[PDB]
Amino acid sequence: QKETEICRQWCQVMKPQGGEEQRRCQQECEERLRD
Numbered sequence: 001q002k003e004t005e006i007c008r009q010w011c012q013v014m015k016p017q018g019g020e021e022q023r024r025c026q027q028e029c030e031e032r033l034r035d
Contacts, residue, residue, distance in 0.1 A: 003033060004029075004033055004035055007029040007032065007033055008025070008026075008029060011025035011026075011029070
């Protein structure tokens with residue numbers, strides 16, 4: 001869950017509370033992380 005935080009927090013800084021931004025970020029994050 002530690003890497004999970006980093007992975008999302010990167011996007012939280014780069015693209016804070018968006019729409020498609022979240023979709024891509026979460027998908028791409030889960031694609032790496034597998035949560």
